[PDB]
Amino acid sequence: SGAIYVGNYRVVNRHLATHNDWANLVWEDSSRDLLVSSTTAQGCDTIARCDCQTGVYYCSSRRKHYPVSFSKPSLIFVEASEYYPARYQSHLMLAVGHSEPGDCGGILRCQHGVVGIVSTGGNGLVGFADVRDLLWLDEE
């Protein structure tokens, strides 16, 4: 589990969104595994606006933050899981690292801010849904 809290937005994995998220929906995209809902309180996270390929992510199944090198956002075939059939996720970045399903939501960050959230994994790879192209998270 986990979310990004920027401005009056809450960014979560679409597959982990709650009824309150869906009842206060701003935007969702199943191909990216992302959903954004509105919040009453303002958040403290800042979104990175960059092309970094190195950063640090939180792994809840290890209670640890790990430094990683990750790929540029791309269209990756991802194997079937409990929440999705086997399909080609978009805007996904891969790194070598440990993950189990409940680590979805952990933040990946660089020197500029939040880069994305854990979305997939398997065989020692972890997959992050990028948010750096969602410029509208910075306003309104």
Ligand X SMILES: CSc1ccccc1CC(=O)N1CCC[C@H]2C(=O)NC[C@H]21
- Tell me which stretch binds ligand X (CB under 6 A): 33-41, 47-55, 87-95, 118-126: 118-126
- Separation CA 20–CA 107 (nearest Å): 21
Does position 112 bind Zn ion by CB under 5 A?
yes
Q: Quick one: 56 or 110, whose CB is closer to Zn ion?
A: 110
Find the DSSP H helices in the chain. Answer: 19-23
Catalytic site includes residue 103:
no
Q: Which stretch binds Zn ion (CB under 5 A): 13-21, 64-72, 111-119, 121-129?
A: 111-119
Among 15, 71, 90, 101, binds ligand X (CB under 6 A): 101
Instruction: Give me the least distance between CB of 127 and Zn ion, in Å please.
Output: 18
**Strand, helix or coil for residue 43:** strand
Q: Is 50 annotated as a binding residue?
A: yes
118 - beta bridge partners? 128
44 is catalytic: no
Q: In what order do the strands lie in the sheet with 107-110?
A: 64-69, 54-59, 107-110, 113-122, 125-130, 87-96, 74-78
